[model samples]
Target chain A: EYLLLTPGPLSTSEAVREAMLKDWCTWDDEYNKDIVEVIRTKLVKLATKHSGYTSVLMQGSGTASVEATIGSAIGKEGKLLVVDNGAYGARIAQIADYLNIPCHAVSPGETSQPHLNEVETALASDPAITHVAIVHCETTTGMLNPIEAFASAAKAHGKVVILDAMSSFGGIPIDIAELGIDFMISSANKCIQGVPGFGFVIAKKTELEKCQGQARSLSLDLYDQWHCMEVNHGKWRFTSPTHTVRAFYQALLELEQEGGIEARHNRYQTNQKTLVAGMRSLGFEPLLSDDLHSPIITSFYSPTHSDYQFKAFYTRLKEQGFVIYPGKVSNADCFRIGNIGEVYPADIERLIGAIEKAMYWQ
Target chain B: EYLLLTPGPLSTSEAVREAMLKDWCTWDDEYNKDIVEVIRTKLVKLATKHSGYTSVLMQGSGTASVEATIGSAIGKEGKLLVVDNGAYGARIAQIADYLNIPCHAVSPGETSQPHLNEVETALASDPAITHVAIVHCETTTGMLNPIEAFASAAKAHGKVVILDAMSSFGGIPIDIAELGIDFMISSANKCIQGVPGFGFVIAKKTELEKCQGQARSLSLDLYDQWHCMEVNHGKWRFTSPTHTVRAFYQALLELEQEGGIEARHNRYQTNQKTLVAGMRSLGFEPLLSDDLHSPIITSFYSPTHSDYQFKAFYTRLKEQGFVIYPGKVSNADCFRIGNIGEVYPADIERLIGAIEKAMYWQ
Candidate 1:
């Protein structure tokens, strides 16, 4: 009775949960420092395509880390250029607006990635723009944006780049320093096979220092957050989610045993390929063409049969022990299935069987 | 092995960890909603005297929820009067300053309670002061503040009252309506006996409505958070920590079975009494005069021995499977031992024995 098709809070190994059974003292020097160092080192390894980048694990959902990065990195006088191709991208813009940080969006639509020429123009025209933020893989439409190009463009214009790599970090290889990205944010629940609780940001020390005292909220202050990690050598400034941190350390160990991102990417890509092929054979068409679709999640166009209501179909599939995600694109009627987390080819096969049975009942 | 002697992230039952073994689908309304609703209803009931207030659970550490309440309830034209008696109270002023909300703090000494007359004068002098925020129990020195007196003053002044009841909520009886307190914040890891991951804000609906669009950061926006929970019927706006939520739900059920807060409070009080008595027998004195000590935690003065280094003492206690917390009060050299969480009188006895052994080890 296991359902493995959800994005995350997806399934995790039993050992991860078992790791959280004991009580942990948040202020205990050795214990807090050990867990902090483990998460920081593991995140750096995940993002280190080059040197000079460090990781700061924050206590909250993925949005908290994203908000902190955007709020802290962009100064009160700075403007943000957002590449809005999906929900997560739009969310970055929303956060910027809420913090009253000057921002402009360049929506490239569902099929397109950010236009390099358009971004170059925006950066050239807006001298006050200090940061450019984008979602590496937009979970909304499951489209993989051209992050390397975006990062280069931002760097060429002397603007810092922040990547919301929540769903793509562990399943895909991202060298933050090599890609010229100043900051990249991800979460425990995403591709790491950890249960959801907290998010982490990897940043260059120099760029992160420039963000000091610019945060609008104390709890999400990235500079203060980073300093605490540095000063305390891995202890959080406030009470952290202890059980979540424990489980995350275990997840990092499991990730290494599974051969890091490269190995995990190969597995996830294979799972995606098998799932897409299986669904296509069953008369289901992918909402995003193969070229733009991410290896993480795929949006499938709802069947046009008279009785095929996605909510009803999704419910029945859930009843049969598989949970699918609702589509995020407003103009389209569809649903999404993710291949990340603890999912595998066998789980994809089970998902296909459930979908087929659901359609038959419909 | 369990070690935490602090209030939260304290030892949880094995059954609570067992509940998190299954990865839950956050979007699966059928499964996740049950956990959300269960915790919400149970938390409101734990208030015992505040059935009229609604609970809005936010994903983050306890400080995040306190920040949310301050950021949301204090508007652009509003001014906040903060009571600075300890670390947590100062945190409210920090949050208010970060959000650029006009705030003034009235600092009371370590042994002094928040002066109701002084708060009244502050409110009267500042016509712009619209809200009053204070911590019910200052865990820094294990002292409980005069929350009822402060709430009464705020109400008489026609100001909205917000209480950071993080360490005191479940164990203390708060009549939300009777006291006219608009918002009270508590965490899953506090007196509720859950694992750490999230916090909750119980607010009067009418007062909450006035907070619309008042948040400066999207991640800590209380009104929007409550709106989503209201519209979706207990679903989080972002990817929630499902495993933590599940564990908290189990904790809530256990709380009910243990006769709600009343039974839990008695057990905790017993643990505290036994711990204080046992430590006194070992020639350890509490930092505060007996009147200011909270049942939640106790700050013990360093014994008059030249070799009593807290670090060494802590290390020995850890080896004995009992972790103690260090004091955070300024100019005070003290250590704290908490009696909350899943701790019992027997555990306190074991801790006292470990402390005695450590004291004589050198």
Candidate 2:
């Protein structure tokens, strides 16, 4: 009944939904080969302009893909150094612990960026660290980490770099080859304007190949997944989200038709600016400075007035055809409004008007 | 665009496909909690008439849930006894191997059913076997394993049972409580009549409580997934497939409105019967005897005609709007046709007609 303003599964175009109007066979190549190949090629090309990278789609949420990247890329003897600035970064460490892999975390807290000096010191000083993980844009508080700085530091130390680019990949572009990132993980629903079901990891071809038989779980085995996709010309190892994958292929085509990443980025950045301006006008302040935030989504400090409740505000806004995300930041009374997906400036403007009508703060 | 004749991701109904027309915020409780709860409740009810079972929906394909069930339910000290008669059953042992959990298998080969006495002998012989895993309907050859027989044996040995009811769950009538099944895994797109994206596990309440933190993988932690959903009023731990879940909920409703599992079961049985008869009339024989077949899918021996190449047979039939499954059995030269999903007698009849048109036997 209303549009979602959360990071994603965000709003998707009618055409993308229409693409799920038919189901495809998961076991065989008959109905899936073309669509799967197109998606894989398109994703790899989008992730990096160079041929150094290969992308593998994993069925599940973004976190599942991130786990697969960590589980597969990091060998048995590998020691992981996690740069923690938010929940997503800490989750990498958690995954390492789950696998019984040795890991150390350099926590710089949630609202701030990981200190470049700290990341540099950790990777350079820790000889046992074979892999380094960091988040691109932590939706925890809409804070953007220094991916380039972390990537450079880890790369210089000869550690495999993993980027949790769940909310940053398409909207905020960077060449994976230039950044020297070994692996980058993101979801289908974010930035690509597809529905949620699966996520993907783009890995350096050589690095991914080194990961054969290293994965602890068969279902999340990145190497086997890539091998099957490549050898069979696009067969998923297990059952895939056929409807969702088809929808994603359509989303990729639409992204290109909408003038690729640059056009989508500009749209999101402008819409983000409009959102901040409108919310600030209603006496609501953003949780992060404009520079610290990524245009994908913004976290706002709660309204100070006694009459203001996030629940009521959310409910009222829902009644007016918009839905906002609850605060994921541990330390703050805040909520988030994503500017990504198929949402345009007009939609954000309508949401702003709804917010104004619901405002009781003075 | 042809309807999937294979086991899911098979053909979903127009109403089910239409449910995927919108996106839901994954981070928020809005548009989710009620629907997730309803689906969970409905799935449990449909899985059994008894109150001993609770269900949890998991992200990714059926294998992911199978892995999760193994990871969470079986602890470090627990040894698994896998009853392997087909691919799905062998996968239990495969999963166990991946997790480094000690396991042994009683493989009676692909086509043959695992004798209950052999399963009982294996369990009795191995005092370390704490869990027994088997498949309900082996999609490998469309062979229906004796769940009741296997259940009684495993239960007698005081070992917990994990049922891979991937293809036979909704299409086959069985009481989980009555069968003494502690954990049964299935997918969204099978007999439930949903699109692919995720799977689920129906766990007995008492058995599930023993698996609090036993999972080795953080992402596939069944206990954590179930606990989060229960504690947070149906909040999935990860970004769930909102569109797919919505579509599944619609499928569940349609299943009920089509007269619950019994009506669905009868429809599928009749469809399977018609398919086999029609294919037999065209000189094709099923791999499984009529007594061993399930309504879900049927594997058939390739046509005796050397001119009737499966590739041409498949392509030609596909051109006429039908898609079938490739053989999953390791030794068999066969093809499969699933009678499940939205396919009815009329569709199967057309498929028979399509086969006649594809006939190159001379």
> Least accurate stretch of 10 residues (summed lDDT) in model 1 chain B?
B43-52
Q: Write the per-residue lDDT of candidate 1 for residues A224-325, one digit (tens) a residue.
A: 988888888887888788877888899999999999999999999998889999999899999888988888999988888887787888878878888788
Which candidate has the highest DockQ of all? 2
Candidate 2's displacement at residue B272, Å, is: 1.8
lDDT tens digits by residue: candidate 1, B1-362 = 76578867787887787777777777767554677876776676666464557889998889999988988888788988999988888889988888888889999876677767788789888888889888888999889888888888888888999988999987766667787779989988878778888999988888888889778778788889888888888889987888778888888878778887778878877888899899999889888887777789988887768877888888888889888888887867888998887688778888888888888534
In the order shown, the candidates' Cα RMSDs to the true structure are 1.7, 1.5
TM-score of 1: 0.97
Candidate 2 residue spans exceeding 4 A from truth: A27-30, B27-30
CAPRI quality level assigned to candidate 2 from its DockQ score:
high
Error of 1 at A149 (Å): 1.3
The candidate maximizing lDDT is: 2
TM-score of candidate 2 on Cα atoms, chains taken together: 0.98
